[PDB]
Amino acid sequence: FMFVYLVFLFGFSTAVVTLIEDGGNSYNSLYSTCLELFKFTIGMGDLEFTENYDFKAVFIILLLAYVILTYILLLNMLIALMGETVNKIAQESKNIWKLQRAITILDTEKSFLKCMRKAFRSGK
Amino acid sequence: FMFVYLVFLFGFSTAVVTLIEDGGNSYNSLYSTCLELFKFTIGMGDLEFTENYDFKAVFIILLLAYVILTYILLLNMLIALMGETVNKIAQESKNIWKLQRAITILDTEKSFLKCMRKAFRSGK
Ligand code: NA
Ligand code: NA
């Protein structure tokens, strides 16, 4: 998810910062544009966070395309994939937890062997 | 999803901009109202973004109806449909990927035929 997300974010951030001319709040920075476009993902994205562009239609089209492609498409697809994965591994997780607890039991027994090596023996 | 979404958005934006009289921040524009109503979708919508209306009850009723119909209903329905689609095509996507890789192999082999037409032959 993060590989795909970062590909999209970097592509659109490079496009946006290329469009901006900074002539402003020094928004003509790759880091600042990347952060401002990432805010869109967490429901805090300002659609007009700058006005240092010669063409407003291009800027708004790029922002809307990014929003629809990541905020609406990628994130909901991730929700769907997480749901599918939860169903697939409903029973496998139980087995993994059992193995983890078994390893815990073995480690605890081996550590406590010093205090009582054969005192705690199973079965009669 | 976008056809339905745009039908709803345009209907309610036309209604809202018709209600507004701009007598303000020149909010009596179709583009501005469309953008302000689209912000509701990305979790950045101001419920009172203007006060140039003669009837406040009508304005707030329209905004609440739009919010409930798009933000709560349409988007969650899209989430559900994406989940259902992910389940349906869990196995088909694998076959499509295999076909894509096969086409890649054929294209690469045909391109490399010039360097060595028969040197890279399969089987003995
Ligand atoms: Na949100
Ligand atoms: Na928010």
Q: Are A47 and A63 in contact (CB under 8 A)?
A: yes
User: Both tokens of residue B7?
Assistant: 């039908």
Q: Which residues of B touch A80 (CB under 8 A)?
A: 79, 82-83, 85-86
The chain A residue lying nearest B39, using CA atoms, is A47
Name the nearest CA neighbour of B109 among B99, B101, B117, B100: B117
DSSP for residue A120? S
Experimental method: cryo-EM
Neighbours of ion ligand 1 (CB under 5 A): A 43; B 43
> Coil, strand, or helix at residue B17?
helix
Interchain proximity B42–A67, CB inside 8 Å: yes
**CB half-sphere exposure, A83, CA atoms < 13 A:** 16
Integer Cα distance of A8 and A62 in angstroms: 12
Residue type, A123: G
